[PDB]
């Protein structure tokens, strides 16, 4: 029976928590996971205060090497726009990238703006102030969301840019996915970006979006998976899943990563971290799919296992997988 600690990204926290609960029931092993956001996950693994870190934003090959870290992907999810719009039900409103960016720039102030109406011709829209919500903490959702906005809105690209932290033009700061979800529930007219499970499991309304190919798409597990169908995983785990081509491709999709040290100074801990994630790849797909995360293809899992064998060792050079 091992006791393991992880910390970081809130994007996959619902599935990691479910996996950890099941794993304890089946094996006795205890995995404690603290949702502090991706930037904090990176900081904590570098400081050696946890057994594993978690970040939705990938580190570069060079940064991994400088830090003596190894990164591997777990699941595929989607970022959605949770909304609180009087008179509208979930899934009714459509936004496109340009107009979403103009909302986040503060240019569009009311839900019945002509640009929103044009995207939604048969819908009656209220004259409700838009209340923009964004992340306060350093965040992989912010990284993915601003990476998307920079592709679809030139003003955003040139003035705000992309990052885990940016100079937001407008918007209240929520801490974690949970904090944005709580703000959208409490504020008539809110819009906030959250990983899909935080909208669904909190009974929050959400929008459709226009795909890269120009078609309205609903956020679903299958549509997150579709956004990754063009990814050449053989080349790198650090795949860009925003604004990807193809039918029913959710435009704000991302995978998410675990970070561990290559030279394990507590090699029993590292061995047990690998066993937890291996168990999750072998047995955990229903639990992920229940929370609307798509599973990585088996080929990707096999790449992860092969890379564990060559990268993860004790201080004598012995592999831990």
UniProtKB/Swiss-Prot annotation:
Pfam families registered for this protein in UniProt: PBP_like_2 (PF12849)
Subcellular locations according to the entry: Periplasm
Keyword Signal in record: yes
Listed name of the protein: Phosphate-binding protein PstS
Single biological process term from Gene Ontology: phosphate ion transmembrane transport
Molecular function in Gene Ontology: phosphate ion binding
UniProt keywords, alphabetically: Periplasm, Phosphate transport, Signal, Stress response, Transport
SUBUNIT field: The complex is composed of two ATP-binding proteins (PstB), two transmembrane proteins (PstC and PstA) and a solute-binding protein (PstS).
């Amino acid at each position: 029976e091992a006791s393991l600690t992880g910390a970081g990204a809130t994007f996959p926290a619902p599935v990691y928590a479910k996996w950890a609960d099941t794993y304890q029931k089946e094996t006795g092993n205890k995995v404690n996971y603290q949702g502090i956001g991706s930037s904090g996950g990176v900081k904590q693994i570098i400081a050696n205060t946890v057994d594993f870190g978690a970040s939705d934003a990938p580190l570069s090959d060079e940064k991994l090497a400088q830090e003596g870290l190894f990164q591997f992907p777990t699941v595929i999810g989607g970022v959605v726009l949770a909304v609180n719009i009087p008179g509208l039900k979930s899934g009714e409103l459509v936004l496109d990238g340009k107009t979403l960016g103009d909302i986040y720039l503060g240019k569009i102030k009311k839900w019945d703006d002509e640009a929103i109406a044009k995207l939604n011709p048969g819908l009656k829209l209220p004259s409700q102030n838009i209340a923009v919500v964004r992340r306060a903490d350093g965040s992989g959702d912010s990284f993915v969301f601003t990476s998307y906005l920079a592709k679809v809105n030139e003003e955003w690209k040139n003035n705000v840019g992309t990052g885990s932290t940016v100079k937001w033009p407008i918007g209240l700061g929520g801490k974690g996915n949970d904090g944005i979800a709580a703000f959208v529930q409490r504020l008539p007219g809110a819009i906030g970006y959250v990983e899909y499970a935080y909208a669904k499991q909190n009974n929050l309304a959400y929008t459709k979006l226009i795909s890269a190919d120009g078609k309205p798409v609903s956020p679903t597990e299958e549509n997150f998976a579709n956004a990754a169908k063009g990814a050449d995983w053989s080349k790198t785990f650090a795949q860009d899943l925003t604004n990807q081509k193809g039918e029913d491709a959710w435009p704000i999709t991302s995978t998410t990563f675990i970070l561990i040290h290559k030279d394990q100074k507590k090699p029993e801990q590292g061995t047990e971290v690998l066993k937890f994630f291996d168990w999750a790849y072998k047995t955990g797909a229903k639990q992920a799919n229940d929370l609307d995360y798509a599973s990585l293809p088996d080929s990707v899992v096999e790449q992860v296992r092969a890379a564990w064998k060559t990268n993860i060792k004790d201080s004598s050079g012995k592999p831990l997988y």
